[PDB]
Amino acid sequence: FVEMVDNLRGKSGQGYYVEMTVGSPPQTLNILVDTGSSNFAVGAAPHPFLHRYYQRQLSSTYRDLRKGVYVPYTQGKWEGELGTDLVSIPHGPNVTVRANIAAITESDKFFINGSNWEGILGLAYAEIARPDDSLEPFFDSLVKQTHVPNLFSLQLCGAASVGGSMIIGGIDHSLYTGSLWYTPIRREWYYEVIIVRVEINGQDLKMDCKEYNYDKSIVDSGTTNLRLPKKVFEAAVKSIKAASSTEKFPDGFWLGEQLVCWQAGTTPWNIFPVISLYLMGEVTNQSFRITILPQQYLRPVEDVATSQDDCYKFAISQSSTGTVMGAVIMEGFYVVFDRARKRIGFAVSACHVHDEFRTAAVEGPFVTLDMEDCGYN
Numbered sequence: 396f397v398e399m400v401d402n403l404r405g406k407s408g409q410g411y412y413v414e415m416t417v418g419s420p421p422q423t424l425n426i427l428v429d430t431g432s433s434n435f436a437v438g439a440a441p442h443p444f445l446h447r448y449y450q451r452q453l454s455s456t457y458r459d460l461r462k463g464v465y466v467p468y469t470q471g472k473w474e475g476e477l478g479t480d481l482v483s484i485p486h487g488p489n490v491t492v493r494a495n496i497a498a499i500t501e502s503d504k505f506f507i508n509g510s511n512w513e514g515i516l517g518l519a520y521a522e523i524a525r526p527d528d529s530l531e532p533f534f535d536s537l538v539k540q541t542h543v544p545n546l547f548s549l550q551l552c553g554a555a556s557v558g559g560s561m562i563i564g565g566i567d568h569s570l571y572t573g574s575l576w577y578t579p580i581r582r583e584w585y586y587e588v589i590i591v592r593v594e595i596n597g598q599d600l601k602m603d604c605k606e607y608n609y610d611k612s613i614v615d616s617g618t619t620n621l622r623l624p625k626k627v628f629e630a631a632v633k634s635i636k637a638a639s640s641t642e643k644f645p646d647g648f649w650l651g652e653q654l655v656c657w658q659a660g661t662t663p664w665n666i667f668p669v670i671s672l673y674l675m676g677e678v679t680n681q682s683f684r685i686t687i688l689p690q691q692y693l694r695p696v697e698d699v700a701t702s703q704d705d706c707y708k709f710a711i712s713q714s715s716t717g718t719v720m721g722a723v724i725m726e727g728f729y730v731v732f733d734r735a736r737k738r739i740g741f742a743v744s745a746c747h748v749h750d751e752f753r754t755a756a757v758e759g760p761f762v763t764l765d766m767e768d769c770g771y772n
């Protein structure tokens with residue numbers, strides 16, 4: 396696994412990518428690591444933002460599936476042609492696999508101007524694969540065709556340029572301190588989990604916990620923010636705003652509609668409280684909690700040419716589709732996607748940003764009753 400350490404790169408707000416090769420001879424591409432989707436989709440045409448794209452005509456091992464795929468988002472989409480081909484990960488396990496690949500032939504507001512990735516690796520399960528769950532995800536193909544154990548782990552560091560590790564098939568104990576604590580994957584579609592309690596600064600929100608997971612809570616390397624359902628976001632902001640009334644910021648800030656700036660080196664960490672999410676544990680009536688800092692939910696915006704300050708965007712936002720524990724959360728922790736035992740492990744990341752005051756934490760066990768009632772059906 397030492398070969399796989401530091402195999403991720405990125406830029407803030409723009410995601411974490413791994414090098415992959417597709418076809419024979421190998422074409423190298425940088426591929427976004429996304430635990431919130433289930434298609435391996437890659438640029439296959441010369442869109443002007445792209446450094447590189449998959450040239451199927453150059454590959455002897457390419458096979459057409461003669462079926463297209465169309466994938467909408469709110470504002471934007473990608474569309475493509477399905478096929479299979481041989482896929483490796485240079486700084487991953489020493490194997491080659493025949494995987495489905497969606498050759499992206501048209502898109503809108505998908506690729507990012509200035510980004511250094513050309514595709515997406517969906518690491519979630521077949522249920523949310525498009526056009527349907529019969530299209531086998533990459534990781535399912537990998538596990539099926541090789542002896543790679545059915546698990547992967549992610550250390551997203553952030554740390555301008557960002558970095559991290561994706562350990563495929565195992566865990567590397569150099570990437571975390573203390574103990575791993577595991578929360579069950581409620582259902583294998585997204586990496587769905589259950590949050591059972593939330594504390595801002597130690598003090599809890601006292602909401603029907605069911606709300607915390609209305610209609611989902613998921614772990615998602617492809618979302619920057621900690622996203623929260625309307626009503627939980629509402630309550631959540633209310634307490635953070637209160638926690639932090641010392642200084643003042645507009646209403647738009649909290650809605651992610653304006654940025655906040657303080658002069659270089661002048662940011663007040665401590666007027667902002669820590670956020671603790673209690674996750675369902677492995678055992679009845681037993682939970683654990685992960686604790687993140689404002690340096691996680693207060694994210695720098697790289698360069699604004701209309702300012703000189705240290706400008707941050709408030710990284711919590713509301714959702715119609717549930718809680719999303721994005722890079723804000725994951726950058727605090729080493730996260731183990733233990734597919735084989737249907738559980739996600741969290742430990743303090745050896746690379747998370749800390750000081751000599753407060754620190755990211757994973758703590759347990761706690762006693763929490765009625766954890767099953769926290770899940771929405």
Ligand SMILES: COc1cccc(-c2cccc(CCc3cccc(N)n3)c2)c1
Nearest residue numbers: 408409410431432505616617618619722
């Ligand atoms: C931290 O990961 C990021 C940050 C910004 C943008 C993306 C990004 C951009 C275009 C496409 C995708 C993959 C599709 C997608 C959309 C929404 C949510 C998820 N998980 N995946 C990601 C990922």
